[PDB]
């Protein structure tokens, strides 16, 4: 196994084993790879089979699988490589305005620009800002959504909110789903009902933790206060909500308002938030962690209304064109999701027309062109594409 | 080479029990890729039952390859005999779903009788599987839909067909006065006018039929004259949207409504049965390849931009929830066929007439949903962590 | 002058007999515009029962020329006991319809009231009974907007026709509708308190009415506010779209609205407001003018199509008058040129209309012609009030 | 009687001193009901006498009387007329808009303005006599004819009765106004009968409306309509599905008779007449003879008023406040009801779909007098009132 692995790479240099290590895409910083890591820092230049089967022994596993090329992206280096093309590509787009209704998405210059990989496998790349923090706001819809139908399943979260697309309420007198602000605003409701905001945002704070693999999430009290004063029509939203009786028994609203608002201004960067679309991506698995953070039915669920609903007006032709589901923030971040591949998180504060990421949006038809993760792509032909998993 | 598949099967071997080994991979023996092979053995026969090295290579040398995969294990479904079996089970627990009214609108979709029910499964390796009434030919109707829109875009390209049509769900014209998708009759009529501009509807209707054939692998295509006179008769809403669609300037330049029309329903009445539609639904999920003839009929752009659109427009008003719950690219008609995709992995054909609400195949629906329930086959399923869902490609 | 009246009702004239006479005319002793002349009556009773050429032609004198045009039968009905008399077999035609459902007052409670452009008064039924405008009072107080601001301005915030939340303009559909009404509201006495503005329409209102009773439901306003979700949601969302003038304080706005739903009125006092639009701005009893015609006019053209809420188009159509329904039951009948009244039943239809109202308004059409583009001159079968 | 007018008009009388003062009350010597006493006139035919004068005026004496006592609905016609003539000019200045081109003949110059009252009062000014298409204008008077021998119940089982804002929630068209609507009421009228009967019946009831005034039907704009009438096929097809039609319509036939009626021709006169009808309760103001039941011309009137300009008509409801017609030839149908009604025409039509002109004559029309429905009779402020 480790003998086996050693080999692989009559004295191996730390410094020669790292970098094989960081080419399979992997990260030191690895929770999987720790106890290894530890091993590594306990021991210090060079090791020798004892040894450093010493150190890799703990994580020997996940080692062999990086070495031997059995990733979902076998080549990332190469993978990488183009994502920065692409990365650059898209950097050229200046068009777009960053939305100034409140200051805080007002501060950010326009030419803030990342973009951060995480496969299902843990392999990480980012270019451009990534650890620049900024608010989820829509983003958090599907994350809160999957929360919502992981801890009351599917049929609950849909006693109050619809599956589909609108094209205020439907006609089973219910949001239309849980990406649009009325069907957010429910779901809101529905997440660990009968306790305070305080805990209840400590809740799902601890969740998005756990997808993150406890990578950067924050919140902006700035972004809240604004969001909170100025949300004239999310509160003509909640009103009509609670006249309609769309909201759980026993909801204080307001207080559904103001958790909403929390929400909308939690904080992520480009690297913590590519983790989040990877536990979409692994199937409610962390890939980082490798803990189960969300049920299978909550990340499929979550998978189809980003898909449907994901992109605001331009889903129709994000989902004909780029075939992938996202979520789209007035942040100018967009959390996309490539299932059983990897995710990711674009931003920059410029937006387009519809309200997406003018760079991000770019990215993402550029992404699709480049290599076969539409959806409806072909695994055996795939044409021109390539494909990132051979 | 053979040789080693020789071994894979005492010093001779019964020529039978290399045949139901070959049946088992759900394979079947009128496969077009397995024609040298087959025939060598028939002829064998005949220089007569049994058979050795030197012998069996003779018959297997041209199509090893494939027969090595089969027998490898090597296709999408490794094992068949067990994945059939399931598909069995959900046919009976279908079977058991009499509600649904059939379509009385013209005779020809009202002779049928409620009970035919039937399932055929082609995997994208040309694994076969039947079962109920595969056999009895109906009418493909707003099944065709999904075909001919990607023949159009398989020839004119994406950019062209789309200038005439548009990409989602309505939810007649919209903003850009285009209709809605390919989907939708404003739509499939709209499509059909694109296709062979510039030719009189004969060879038009025989262009379309060729590439049904190819797409169904030579299998069975053909034509009701009966439900074409009968929907031409009816069509009265069809026409409308004809005028609606000339008065808009929908149609490219030059097009004559009238007969786009005759097309159109000429397009509608094209016969197919459960099997032989089955493969057409494989071809898609092949990326444009015939699983069983290996040819390339579609274009992976034709393909994809189809898939696309039966998971978005496919199902009727039960799109949004189909797509949702199944998951799953799939076209219904009033024939009550429920044309289905399941990308990589297979394609089928359910067949009742009695028809929900919606507009859909009720045993076909409910089949449908089963299906996604047992293995995970919806589009958003993880292929590494599915829960207690059964994964027939493992 | 005086004189001949006189003579028009012997040597002596007993005053039974000329209250008798007037009230026939369907005036009442309490017109405010007979005040003099039977403030003399009075008082001649005092100096004691019959008048004659000089002792009448004093108390007569000051009011003359109304109780000439009253006897000349020179009033919008020439005979309105007869009219009046229609009027009470509508009623009873309409109090059998008992169908319909209270808004949640007694469901038997129902009641007609009259009143001309000349103040002719009839009352039948529970006219009495004070009950809560509601959207009754959405034509009055946009009446009451274009009165001040004019319609040029009025309009630049609220639509003139019917919606089929907001229009293409991003300006609610008309006055009638809850955001125009919400919108509306926003218009009147700006720069001023609740308390200030409630007066300022109350005012209006009392003038409208003739000063007949006009009155506030605490009970009525504390429920519309603590219930409002809808209307909350509405000023949200006209905040958020910038419908409101600007420096609106929405919060506020919505309590006033909620303030001029809960006015209460009878029967009668509603009549003459809806006899005050039917007058052209001038209160039939006081003879004040209380509207500029162009308020008039506007509020008349937006209950004809924008009033009985989706059973306007039907109820147009049928009926062809001017009128406004709200959930306490009343609906406010104009006749432009005639009279106008309030029907007031608690039991809704399915519209959200009174079921004896909405009944009594297609009886009164059927009967008499007050249709909109029913003719004058060729009336068919339908009796015409004016001759 | 006659006597009594004799000296309203000295010894004896000239007759043609007699014309002008008749001409003055906005009757017309044309007049169908003043034919026996204009007979009389040139029977005799230059001063005339009593007995001369009672023999020639005997015949009709009723309506003589009224119009020289100043009876008729507006007593000073003369001075009216004047106020139209402005307000003609003022329009007439409007150079805006397009002629349908989809009619391109038609001057885009062309405007007039034709007034009959309820009394048979005349006044033309502009380009009256010049025959164009009623075409959307028919609408109203199509529909008129069918409640008038179908009965409300029966029309409107068909057809709706509101403003759409293809279909309402019935699965019946929207109202007789809009094309679809227009449509059904057609194949209602004069049924179990050819398209040449059908169209026979509808001119003549379309005579008896405007009082034996040009009424003709242009085959050139028919022919065009139907080769460009894609859009009513669709339509037909749509109604057809629906089975918004009689049993037994033939609906390619209707079309046919749908495109001959737009094709009908009438002349601001002819039609200001048409209009008047409307006006008068179903009475034509100039022959006397009663064309439609007072229940086909309500509903007509509340039809036009609310369906009648297309999109403008909540605008022109509330500002207007007149039932009129509209029609792509560019005509406006206008009618005052109890007052009288008239044909404003002129070709260039503004984005709505109104000639531009006419819309505009209109407004000017209601802004001066009022006979803007919820006006006040007895306060107009500073209006002015014709019927004064």
């Given at each position: 196994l480790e003998d086996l692995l050693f080999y692989t790479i009559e004295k191996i240099p730390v410094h020669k084993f790292i970098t094989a290590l960081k080419s399979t895409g992997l990260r030191t910083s690895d929770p999987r790879l720790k106890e290894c890591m530890d091993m590594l820092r306990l021991t210090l230049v060079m090791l020798d089979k004892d040894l450093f089967k010493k150190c890799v022994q703990s994580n020997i596993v996940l080692l062999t699988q990086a070495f031997r090329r059995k990733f979902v992206i076998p080549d990332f280096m190469s993978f990488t490589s183009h994502i920065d093309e692409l990365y650059e590509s898209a950097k050229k787009q200046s068009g777009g305005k960053v939305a100034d209704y409140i200051p805080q998405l007002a501060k950010f210059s326009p030419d803030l620009w990342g973009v951060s990989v995480c496969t299902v496998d843990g392999q990480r790349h980012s270019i451009g800002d990534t650890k620049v923090p900024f608010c989820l706001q829509s983003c958090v819809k599907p994350l809160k959504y999957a929360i919502a139908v992981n801890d009351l399943g599917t049929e609950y979260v849909h006693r109050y909110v619809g599956k589909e697309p609108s094209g205020f309420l439907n006609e089973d007198d219910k949001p239309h789903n849980p990406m649009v602000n009325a069907g957010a605003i429910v779901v809101t409701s529905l997440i660990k009902q009968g306790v305070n905001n305080a805990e209840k945002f400590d809740y799902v704070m601890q969740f998005l933790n756990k997808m993150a693999g406890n990578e950067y999430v924050g919140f902006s009290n700035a972004t809240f206060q604004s969001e909170r004063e100025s949300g004239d029509r999310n509160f003509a939203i909640g009103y009509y909500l609670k006249e309609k009786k769309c909201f759980p028994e026993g909801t204080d609203m307001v207080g559904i308002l103001d958790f909403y608002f929390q929400l909308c201004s939690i904080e992520v960067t480009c690297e913590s938030a590519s983790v989040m679309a990877a536990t979409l991506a692994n199937g409610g698995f962390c890939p980082i962690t490798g803990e189960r953070v969300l049920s299978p039915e909550a990340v499929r669920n979550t998978l189809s209304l980003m898909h449907s609903?994901?992109?605001?007006?331009?889903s129709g032709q994000f989902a004909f064109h780029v075939g992938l589901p996202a979520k789209s923030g007035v942040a100018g971040g967009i959390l996309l999701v490539v299932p059983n591949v990897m995710g990711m998180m674009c931003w920059s504060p410029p937006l387009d027309k519809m309200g997406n990421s003018v760079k991000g949006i770019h990215f993402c038809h550029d992404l699709v062109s480049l290599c076969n993760f539409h959806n409806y792509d072909n695994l055996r032909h795939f044409a021109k594409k390539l494909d990132p998993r051979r």
């Open positions: 609903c994901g992109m605001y007006d331009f």
